[PDB]
C-alpha cells in the first residue's frame, strides 16, 4: 500500500490529508477514542513536525547568507522597510477584523460574575531596548544551538554582506576564499531545500495525523459559547485573507487566486504544526519553487515575518478579550478593547511563531489589566474555557500568518523586480 499512496497525484494529496484527518478526528473523539488517536495516529504527525524542525536552522542560516550576498545592502535595507510597512498595514486591518467579528458574533453570552478587584499592578513597564539589543547574538554558535531565529538572521545578513565585499576585493586569494565560503552555504541551503521536498512526500500522512489528534481532543469542545469564539476567529481569518491579502496582492498586480494555490502547502503545514518557524522550510521552498521569489528577498522577509507578524495575534486577542469581558459581565467599550489588543500586539512583537502563543499572551493581558485569576474565580473560568479550545484557535492563528508572510514576500519581491513572472504563467 506504500506504492498505492505515492502514485496517487500529489497536487491535492496534502489537502485530502487535512479534510480526511479532521473528519476522522471528530468521529474518533465523538465516540470516545481520542486516546487511541494519541497513541496510534499522532506519532506519525510528531514525526512530520520533527523532520521540519530539523531543517529550520540550516535552511535559515544558509539561505540568508547566500541571499544577503546576492543583493546589495541598500536594497536589503529597502526590503526591510517595505516588509515592515507591509506588516504594520496588515496588522492594522487584523485589529479591525478582530474587533468587528468578535462583536458580530457577540462572543460570551454565558454568565459568571466579577469585575475585579485588583490585584493592582503597574507593571514592568514594557521596555523594548533589551529586546532590540538581544537581536545581536553575543555568540552566533550559541544562537544556532539554541535555535534563536532572530540573532541568526542578524549574523547571516552581516556575514552575507561581508562576503560580497570580499569577493569584490583586489587580492585573488581573498576573493577565492570568500567565494568558497559562499559556495558552502549555497551547497547547504540547496541540500536543505532538497530535503524539504522529500519531507513533503510524507506530509499528507503527517498532516492527517496532526489534524486528527487536534480534532479528536478539542473538536468535541467546540459547542455553545466556544463555538461562537471559533466561528468569530475563523471568520476573522477568512476576512484577513480574502480582503486584506487579496486587495493588496491585486493592488500590486498579483493574481490572488494564483497565490492561494501556490501557498497551500505552506498554509496547511502552518495550520497543523501551529508554528511559523517550524513551517519555514516549507514556506521558503514554496516561495522558491511556486512563487518564484528570489532568495534575495524571501531568505530575509520570511524568517523575519515568522517572528514579527502581528496579524494572528490581533485576531486572537480581539476575539478572546471580548469573550472574557462578556463572560464576566465587565463592560468594555470599543475603544478600551482597541487599547487592550494594541498593547498585547505591541507586547508580542519579538516572539516567533510557537504553539500555545495567544493563550499565554491572553493570560498576561488579563493579569496586567488587574483581573483576578485565582482558581475558581470567574476570569480563571473564562480563561480556562478559551485555554481548552486553544489548539483549534492556534491552527488558524498560525495559518493566517504564514499566508500573510507569503503575500508580503511576494509583494515586496514584485516591487523589487525579484519575482519571476514565468512561474505565474499557467497552461
Amino acid at each position: 500500500l506504500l506504492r498505492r499512496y505515492l502514485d496517487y497525484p500529489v497536487l491535492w494529496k496534502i489537502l485530502w490529508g487535512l479534510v480526511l484527518g479532521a473528519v476522522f478526528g471528530l468521529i474518533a473523539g465523538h465516540f470516545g477514542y481520542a486516546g487511541a488517536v494519541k497513541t496510534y495516529i499522532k506519532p506519525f504527525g510528531d514525526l512530520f513536525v520533527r523532520l521540519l524542525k530539523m531543517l529550520v536552522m540550516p535552511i535559515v542560516l544558509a539561505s540568508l547568507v547566500v541571499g544577503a550576498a546576492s543583493i546589495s545592502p541598500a536594497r536589503l535595507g529597502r526590503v526591510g522597510v517595505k516588509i515592515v510597512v507591509y506588516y504594520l498595514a496588515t496588522s492594522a486591518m487584523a485589529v479591525f477584523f478582530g474587533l468587528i467579528v468578535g462583536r458580530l458574533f457577540n462572543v460570551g453570552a454565558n454568565v459568571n460574575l466579577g469585575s475585579g478587584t485588583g490585584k493592582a499592578i503597574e507593571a514592568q513597564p514594557p521596555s523594548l531596548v533589551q529586546t532590540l539589543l538581544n537581536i545581536v547574538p553575543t555568540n552566533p554558535f550559541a544562537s544556532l544551538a539554541k535555535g534563536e531565529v532572530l540573532p541568526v538572521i542578524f549574523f547571516a545578513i552581516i556575514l552575507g554582506i561581508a562576503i560580497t565585499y570580499l569577493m569584490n576585493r583586489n587580492e585573488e586569494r581573498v576573493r577565492k576564499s570568500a567565494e568558497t565560503l559562499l559556495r558552502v552555504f549555497d551547497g547547504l541551503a540547496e541540500a536543505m531545500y532538497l530535503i524539504v521536498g522529500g519531507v513533503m512526500q510524507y506530509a499528507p500522512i503527517g498532516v492527517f495525523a496532526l489534524i486528527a489528534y487536534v480534532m479528536a481532543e478539542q473538536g468535541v469542545r467546540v459547542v455553545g459559547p466556544l463555538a461562537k469564539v471559533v466561528g468569530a476567529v475563523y471568520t476573522g481569518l477568512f476576512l484577513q485573507i480574502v480582503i486584506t491579502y487579496f486587495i493588496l496582492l491585486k493592488v500590486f498586480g498579483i493574481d490572488p487566486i494564483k497565490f492561494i494555490r501556490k501557498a497551500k502547502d505552506a498554509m496547511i503545514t502552518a495550520f497543523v504544526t501551529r508554528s511559523s518557524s517550524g513551517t519555514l522550510p516549507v514556506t521558503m521552498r514554496v516561495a522558491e519553487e511556486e512563487m518564484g521569489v528570489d532568495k534575495g528577498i524571501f531568505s530575509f522577509t520570511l524568517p523575519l515575518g515568522a517572528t514579527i507578524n502581528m496579524d494572528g495575534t490581533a485576531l486572537y486577542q480581539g476575539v478572546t478579550v471580548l469573550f472574557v469581558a462578556n463572560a464576566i459581565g465587565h463592560p468594555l467599550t470599543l475603544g478600551q478593547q482597541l487599547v487592550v489588543v494594541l498593547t498585547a500586539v505591541l507586547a508580542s512583537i519579538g516572539t516567533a511563531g510557537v504553539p500555545g502563543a495567544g493563550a499565554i499572551m491572553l493570560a498576561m493581558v488579563l493579569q496586567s489589566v488587574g483581573l483576578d485569576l485565582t482558581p475558581g474565580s470567574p476570569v480563571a473560568l473564562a480563561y480556562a474555557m478559551i485555554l481548552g479550545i486553544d489548539a483549534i484557535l492556534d491552527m488558524g492563528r498560525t495559518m493566517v500568518n504564514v499566508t500573510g508572510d507569503l503575500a508580503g514576500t511576494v509583494i515586496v519581491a514584485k516591487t523589487e523586480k525579484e519575482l519571476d513572472e514565468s512561474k505565474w504563467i499557467s497552461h
Copy 2:
C-alpha cells in the same frame, strides 16, 4: 637521546599492548601495597588526558565521515547495510544471552548467604517508551545535537545530508553541482584531518592505556576475591566464548580470517577496554576499520557509530551473570527460563543507549527495582548490588571491549558481502 625520543622510537605494533600488560601489573602491585591513592593522583591524569583527546574527535569524525560515507554509496545499498548490520546484532546478542546464562550457572555465582524478602515478578509497572525513543532519532536542531554530543541524531542528520549531496552533484545546473561538491569537500577535508589526528593520539595511547588500566587495577583489583572473583571469571569467560566462538565462527562463515582480524582490531579492543566507552573509542575503531581492516567509509561510517549505540552483546553477558549472582546471594529461586526473561527485558530496555561507563550497574539497579526487590540500605539485595557495584569497572572493561570487537566483526562481514572490503589488506 632523551626519554621522549626513545619512547616514540620503539616500534608501535605491540607498544599499546605493553602499556596494557605493564599497566595492569603495575596497578595490582600498587593496590596490594596501599598506594592506589598515589596512582589516582600521579598516574591517572595521564589516562584521563587520553580519554579527552579521543572524545574531542567523536562528533567531528562521526559527522564528517558519515556525510562523506553516505554520499559515496547509493541510498538503496545504505538501506541494505542498515538491515544487514541490524540482523547481525540480533544474531550475536542471542549468542551473548546464551553464553551469559551458561557461564553464569557454570561458575554458579553466589553461595555467599544473605536472605531476601519478596518478588515479583515484573509488577509494579513497565511502561513502553519505544515510540518516543524512535521519534528522538530525528534531531529537531542538528546544531544542538552536535553541541550536546548526541550520536544517534547526528547519524541521522549526516546520512540525510550525504544522500542529498550526491543528488545535487548529479543535477544539471553547474552551480548547484559546484556548490554541493564544495560542501562535500569540506566534510571530506574535515574527516581526513580527524583520522590524521587519531593517528597522532595513538602515539600517546600506550601511556594513556597504561595510566587507565593501572588505576582500575589498583582500585578494584584488591576487590576481586572470594565470590566476586567468580563473577569476574564468569563474565570474562562469557567474553572469550562470545569472541572465539560467536565472532570467530561468523567471520569464518563469510570468509574472513579470524586470527588476522584480532591482530588488526587490537588497538580498538584495548582502547575500548580501558576507556570503557564505545562512543569514545569510535575514532580508534573507525581508523582500525580504515587502515587495518580495509573497509570502505560507505560501510563503517554507518555501521560503527550505529553499533556503538545498538550492540546488545556486552549487556546480555553482564546482566546474565550478575542477575544470577544477586539471586543466589539472597537465596531467591530463579529458573533458567525466569533468568532468560529478565536478561531479555534488560537487553530490550538498553537498546539505543550508547556505550558509557557505569552502564550495567545502572541497568542492573533498574532490573532489581522493576522486579520488586527491596533495595533499601542494609537489605540483602542492596548488599549484593553494592558488591557488584564495587567491581563494576573491571566488568565494564570487558563489556566495552567485547562490543567494539563485535562492532568491527559485523562491519567487516557486512563490508565483504557488499564487496566493500579491500582484500589486499588481508593477503598473507
Copy 3:
C-alpha cells in the same frame, strides 16, 4: 547629524569619545543624573559590546586554524614558550609595581578594626591538573557554543596543523579537500576582520556611552581613601606601560611611541569594555593592520594572552590587599603581602578577561586567609568600599593587559621575523 559624525576624521575619534564621555559622565553623576545616563546613553555602549562579542568565537577559531596552518609546528611551540616567558617576566614586574605604589600611596588610612592572621584555612592547595586537562575539549562543537576560548585555541591549532599535513599529501583528492577546508576558514576569518572594521565606525559612540555610564555611577565615589586606591592603581598601570612595556619593546628594537599610537584602539576598547576576550576582534585587527604581525603569531598569542595575562591582577591585588590590611589595622609585612599576591595570581591563571574579575578574586583572598567577611565586619566594610569603585579599577586593569598582550605579541613576532617593517618606517 548622521552624516557629520562619519565625515569627522577617524584618526583620533575614538579617543575623543573616551575623554568627552568621561567628562560627560562625571558631570552627569555630580548633578544626580546617572540614572538618565543608564537609560538613554548606556544601550549605545552595550550595543558596541554585543557587536564585538558576536565576533570573538568565529574570528578566534578561523584566524587560528588559518594561522596554525601557515606556520610549522616547531615555530608555534617556540612562539608558545616565548610568549609564556614574556608573561612571566611582565607579571613579575607587575607584582613589583603593585607592592611599590600601594605602599607609596599608603592606601587605607581610614580606621576600622579586626585581625585574621591565618593562611590556607579555606583550605585548597589548589589543584591545577584538571585545569590543564580542561584545555582539551571533549566536544569542540560544545566548546564553541559555550564560548570557551582556551579549548577552541587547542582545537584550532591541531586542525590547522593537520590541514597542512593533508595539503602535502600525494593524493590530489586529499590535497584539494584540505585546501577547500582551509579556504572556508580563510574566508570566514576575512569576513570577521571586515566586520570589525565596520563596528569600529561605531566605536566612538560606543566608547562614549560606556565611559559615560561608568563615570556617572562610580566617579562620584572616588574621593577620600578610595581616591588614593584609584590613584595607586592607575600609577601602577602607567609604570607597567611606560617602564615594563617600553623597555622590553626597546630592548628588542621596537619604537615604543609608534607602538602606543598603533595600540590605542585596542587599549581604549579594553578600557571601556573591561574584557580582554570581548576586545579580541579589535586587538587582533590592530595586530594585523597596524602592527603588521603575521597571523601565524597573533592568532595564537593574543587569545592565549586574554586568558593567561597576570599583569592587571598583580596590580589590582597588590593595592587592594594593602588597602584592606591598613583599613582594618592588620599589620602586613612586605614579604607577607608578596605571598598573598602570588597565591592570588596563581589562583587566577586560566580565567579569561571578564568584568568583575578582581572584586571576586579579592573576596576569595580575604576569605582564604581567614578574615571575617560576615556583614558589618571591618573586612566586609573595606571590601565593600573597593567593590563600589571596582568598575573604575576594572577599566584600568583590562587596558594594561591588552597593551601588554600587543607588546608581547609584537616582540615574539619580531624575534620570529614575522613583523612587517614597512608599517613602522614612516
